[PDB]
Each structure stands twice: as structure tokens, then as C-alpha cells.
Write a protein that binds this ligand. Sequence first.
Ligand SMILES: CCCCCCCCCCCCCC(=O)SCCNC(=O)CCNC(=O)[C@H](O)C(C)(C)COP(=O)(O)OP(=O)(O)OC[C@H]1O[C@@H](n2cnc3c(N)ncnc32)[C@H](O)[C@@H]1OP(=O)(O)O
Ligand SMILES: Cc1nn(C)c(C)c1NS(=O)(=O)c1c(Cl)cc(-c2ccnc(N3CCNCC3)c2)cc1Cl
Length: 387
Amino acid sequence: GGPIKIIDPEKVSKEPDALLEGFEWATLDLTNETELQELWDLLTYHYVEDDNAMFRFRYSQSFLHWALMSPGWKKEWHVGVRATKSRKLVASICGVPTEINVRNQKLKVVEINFLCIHKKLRSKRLTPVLIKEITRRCYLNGIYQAIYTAGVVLPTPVSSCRYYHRPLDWLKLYEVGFSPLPAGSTKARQITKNHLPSTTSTPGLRPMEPKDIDTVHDLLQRYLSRFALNQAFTREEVDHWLVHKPETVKEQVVWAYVVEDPETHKITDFFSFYNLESTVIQHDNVRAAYLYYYATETAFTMKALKERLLMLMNDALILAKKAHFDVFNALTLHDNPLFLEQLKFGAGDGQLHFYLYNYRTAPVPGGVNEKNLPDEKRMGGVGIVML
Ligand SMILES: CCCCCCCCCCCCCC(=O)SCCNC(=O)CCNC(=O)[C@H](O)C(C)(C)COP(=O)(O)OP(=O)(O)OC[C@H]1O[C@@H](n2cnc3c(N)ncnc32)[C@H](O)[C@@H]1OP(=O)(O)O
Ligand SMILES: Cc1nn(C)c(C)c1NS(=O)(=O)c1c(Cl)cc(-c2ccnc(N3CCNCC3)c2)cc1Cl
């Protein structure tokens, strides 16, 4: 594996390509509230929908702040297109920097996210234009590789993972057409099936605190090192992505929990999940929690891993329900296939395909077999979660 081509610093153009008549490039400043609102306005009405046009992702402004101003961020990688006359923001494409491990090679990359074009400008081949411009702005900052995730199949995916969904409020989900009433059943029965204990069971479980950063950082890195493709977390990245700052973030987006051993008081496990609503195109919102990063000391010894994950993740479900989330989403990546079925996650129609730009490596297993169902012998591949 390795880079596909070497970029000649000397030949990177200082000026962007031309755009469709009536439109112009605009760097976004997401520290400006009005511009943050503008991006929110665009995504809210024009971002990812399901195939049935029932749901649309509704990233919050707090989520956008958190996702796009992570450690090392640069406004130059928050790319917009405006209408010249009205000034309206009509397209976007964004990146943030991070380091990844691809089979034990560390790479400096940008994660690409929030590619969006206003419905009225679709199917004009603007996308390749947006991609080329953010590529140019990255090349200018000495970054020549990218990773991204997509719901559609494009050239040479590195992996594919299937979405799974654990109902927390089944009735709400049924109500908005997310979950159906199977057939011979009743609401009462579906509610019973999905009912969850009132309290967590794992001893020492508590909300992560800033004091936990160093030891969570070390445990996470050891755990993720067990995957061919993974995110190479720095200390600042643990602070940013994992510890919610209530004093400065009124709308919480990340929940993280640690298990502090009753005896050693060392943290021995942790898990986290984030808040991403969907607008119900027509109630008006599905409040979904997504599983994010987790780690357990048990990984390093088996089959105690499955057993430990069953404990932690059922606790994660309890905590999410307690925080009023409607559903708990997870993909077949990390060691997730160990617990999805047994904790009653239902298989989803959604598939997330993973891609690298300007880097060649063999395909990596995505937690499923050729039938697109979870497989314990198909893990160890994908250890990176994108938002
Ligand atoms: C070194 C640094 C490198 C940095 C860059 C690394 C590359 C990152 C790449 C971007 C990572 C994004 C990660 C995310 O954010 S995935 C999120 C994508 N956004 C959405 O799904 C929101 C809803 N949809 C839209 O806003 C539009 O439909 C979009 C913008 C998706 C397409 O607009 P439109 O429908 O009006 O099409 P077009 O006429 O302009 O262009 C048609 C071309 O676009 C290619 N296309 C379609 N969808 C995607 C897609 N999701 N990734 C990459 N390419 C895509 C398509 O194959 C076709 O090419 P092909 O040859 O026929 O021509
Ligand atoms: C409730 C709901 N709301 N929306 C908008 C949808 C599609 C559903 N139904 S879903 O929950 O079962 C679901 C989910 Cl979560 C996610 C994807 C999916 C597929 C491909 N790509 C992405 N992303 C683009 C890149 N950034 C990461 C997310 C998401 C598809 C489905 Cl179908």
C-alpha cells in the first residue's frame, strides 16, 4: 500500500477554477454565527435523505461547531458556494484534519464531510468542481490524502459497513414510519420486546471527566490498534471529541462514559455516543443516538470480549433511553458484530462505504459477510467512525 501520486508543491494553482455563471467561491467562517446559521439552513433542507424521502439528517448548529472546529481545523477547508447577487449559500464541502493508520502506516489526512448542493442546482456536475477545489485548498496546506464515507457506491471502496438500529422508543418510531408493526403483532408486544432496565448494571460506570483524558487516550489507542484502518487519536482529539463542555456547549452533542474499577480505580472501559436528529419530512423529529468510540481492557486477553461488550452496550442503551433518544444506531465496524443481534439491534437498509483518496491499500473487512450480515470472523478491519 502507499500513496498513488506525489503532488508537486510547485504546480498547485493559487487560484480556483471557474464556476457556473452567477455563482462564486466563498470560504465559510463558522465562528461567525450568521454563517454557521447559513450552513445549517442549507443542510437542514438539502442534506442527506433516505430513499423514500421520509427523513433528512438534521445536524445541529452545536454539532456543526463540534464536527468542523476540531483540533487543527482551518477555515480554508470550510468551502462554500454563494450566489453572486443574492449572496445565498447554495453549496458546501468541508474537511477537518486528522491522522489515520492504514495497516500500520500513519497518514496525515483530511476527513471530507457535508458535501451539499441546493436541490435546485443538482445534476449540473458541480460536485466534481467542489471536490477539485477542496482538493486544491488541501494540497496548498501540505495535505495530499483524504478519507471519506458515503451512502453511495463510488470507485474502489476500502470497506462497506451496514447500519443497525436499536429501538428505544418503539412507539415513536412506529409513529413516524421508521419501525413497522410486524404482521401478527401488537404495539404492546413490540414495546415489551424493546423494554430496557431502568438502571445500568456495570460497576463503576460514570460520565467521563477531563481527568480521565490521559488514561482513556491510552486505552483507546491500544484498542483501535486492533483494526487495519483506524483513527490515530491525539490527546487534544480525545478532549475535543469525547468530553462534553457544558459551560460552553448548551446543546450537548457527545455523551461519554467510563468504567472506573471499583478496586484499582483505573478506568478499564469506556463508550460514547452522539446526538444526530432526523427531520421527519411531514411528529417532526427522530432523535437518534449514534454509537461512537469505545474501548475495553478485556479486548487484550476470550471470549470474555463479547460478554463485556454485552454489558457495556446494554448500559449504553439504558443511558441513551434515559436521555430521551428514540433509537440507538450502530454500524458493523469495530467489534460491533459481537453484540448487535443479541442486544436487539435490527438490520437497516443503510450502508456506509469507506474511501481513501490518493492512497492504495487492500480492501479491509467491514464486519459483514457476503450476505451483508454481521460476521465475527469479518471484524478487525474498520476502526474509524466518521460523522
Ligand atoms: C487531498 C484532499 C482531497 C479532498 C477531496 C477528497 C474527495 C472527497 C469526495 C467527496 C466526499 C463527500 C462525502 C459526503 O459528504 S457524503 C454526503 C453527500 N451529500 C448528500 O448526500 C446530500 C444530498 N445530496 C446532495 O447534496 C447532492 O446530491 C450531491 C452533492 C451529493 C451530488 O450532487 P449532484 O447530485 O447534483 O451531482 P453532480 O451533477 O453535481 O455531480 C455528479 C457526480 O458527483 C458524484 N457524486 C455523487 N455523490 C457523491 C458523493 N456522495 N461523494 C462523492 N461523489 C459523489 C457522482 O458519482 C457523479 O460523478 P460521476 O463521474 O458521474 O461523474
Ligand atoms: C432515520 C434516517 N434519516 N435519514 C436521513 C436516514 C437515511 C434514515 N434512515 S436510517 O437511520 O436507517 C439511515 C442512516 Cl442513520 C444513515 C444512512 C446513511 C447512508 C449513507 N451515508 C450516510 N451518511 C453520509 C456521510 N456521513 C455519514 C452519514 C448515512 C442511511 C440510512 Cl437509511
